[PDB]
Amino acid sequence: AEIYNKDGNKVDLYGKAVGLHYFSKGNGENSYGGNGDMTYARLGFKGETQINSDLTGYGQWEYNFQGNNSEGADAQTGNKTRLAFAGLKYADVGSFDYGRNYGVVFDALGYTDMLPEFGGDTAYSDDFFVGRVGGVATYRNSNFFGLVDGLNFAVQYLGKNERDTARRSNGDGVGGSISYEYEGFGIVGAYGAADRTNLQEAQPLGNGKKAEQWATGLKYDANNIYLAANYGETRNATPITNKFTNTSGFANKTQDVLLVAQYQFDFGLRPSIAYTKSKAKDVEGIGDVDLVNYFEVGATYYFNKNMSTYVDYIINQIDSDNKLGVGSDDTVAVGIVYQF
Template identity: 55%
Template sequence: MKKSLLALLVSALALTSTAHAAEIYNKDGNKLDFYGKLKAMRYISDADTNASNNADKSYVRIGFKGQTQINDLMTGYGQWEYQYNLNNPESDSNVGNKKRLGFAGLKFGNYGSVDYGRNYGLIYDVEAITDMMPEFGATAYTSADVYMLTRTNGVATYRNSNFFGLVDGLDFALQYQGKNENASRSDSASNGDGMAASLSYKLIEGLSIKGAVSSSNRTFDQKDTAYGRGDKAEAWATGLKYDRDGIYLAANYAETRNMNPINGTAQVAGNDVAVSGYANKLQNIEVVAQYQFDFGLRPSLAYVQTKVKDIENGIGDADYYKFVDLGATYYFNKNMSAFVDYKINLLDDNNTLAKNTDDIVALGVTYQF
């Protein structure tokens, strides 16, 4: 295999886990691809404050993507994805397993596509450009099932590429999320009705700008807390990405209101105060730089900082996450890679919300198809 071809393959692999799905059926306008990933991984940390930071983190992830040609204009499609954790004994084999994606929809040529189910929220359209670290990407404010920050339930999504085929590089999306609240869901994983939108434009070859906004009703229990004011949970994010000739640079900035759960023990006037509620305001910045060498090596450098603002009861502002990420992935070919990712925690030992301050090294080998 030529070195330049290997660089192209692993660059595509770094950007999407389904770049090399196995085609299992393709006939008469019907196509079905099966994809998967086995990540054999260990976290290493010398701190005793959190046992999960020094433990096996292996898992296998599988899914399928299918489509069917209905007529000259209309195409049906669907995707499902599930993760099985491999770090539990057989007696607890279901612990931590999770349904990641499951949606179906219709595409109408240049008029766009509409789908419904468990899918990515549109704020992740921006977060995705910095979710590139070998292991610790998208670990600050974009938790799953927190409104439309990342994977979530009950979203109807409309997407349009190249603005109805009229403007190359101009993509937009609209999203509606129905209320998710019942006895089996925690308050932090519940939501009221909401809307979101995202926009992306390719400025020049390799350089694009992205933005996204969302606004949702909060549930009664979310509003009935000591921390977190307001009837609406809101978010916005914007970012820039440059991806060309092996160079990958990306940065984004995001803010949320009354959306992200905050928990911990804060020091106020020398006294411990239990904090359990939602951040009135959160600010997040992420920067990532990577380079793809022809022989398969992809080093990575990133910085992440998340602050929560205006916490009640005299607590004020506090750092929520703050770390430098040093990583590298070596791609043996399109299916096999090895990686190391070092999360250097920059939070002070006596940080306001008593957040974990462990440094963590992730080591692993990944097979995917």
């Protein structure tokens, strides 16, 4: 909500309290999403100041507070800053921002990251360019310097983040996206490549000095209908774990497909149908194996802009004999959301 707007500066202080519960069978160790309380809250601010008629400065910060921990020792589990960046936007020359932000390959993966609760499975955090990452310098142009309405592009510089863990690290890299929107249609293409750290190369799964990710996207977004498809491939970038062996690393290559179809009724209801499949190829010792593979059916009911409820159901197609130990059980999520 906009809580301040004076002298050229506007601040939006936003957040949500999500009462959320996952229903699966087991111990929930063989299901898609897990089981039990998943309640969380979000808090963030978004600021924008008009320096002059052509120049805008902006900043954004967003945090995740889990609401399913006790008030004991595990109290901070899962808490974290999601976004933290500041930038400048100038006329039709473009915008530049630096900090913790979305990788450029999410410019394409955002097309299908619209399910009520699940979906967006290949947009991993701290995984080069597909999700939220630290230390990215992003340059974005809209409408090709004001000359081609609807044609955008971006280039992103990713600085090395040598962390304690192979999973959360990355070396330097460069990525870019180009997209075109016209009358409800949109097409995007996005590609990133980066070096891998020593710690990443010491991992038993995956071999290579460079990580690459690319995705394509196609959508139709108008007349209360939302249809979108993504196709992407990664080399040495998708994090995987062999549960049997307890060995971890990156998939040599993945081939990813995500499809979503939703419809927004005027009275508030928004059904959703999706299909997601991600398969790893050439995994040392396993060969080809599915990482993700389901059908989704769900609905969101929007009481208004501040309140909603949803049910999200994953009809998991992972087989029980999946070679990496990837869970095969279904998951149903039910949620009540207040937001401002």
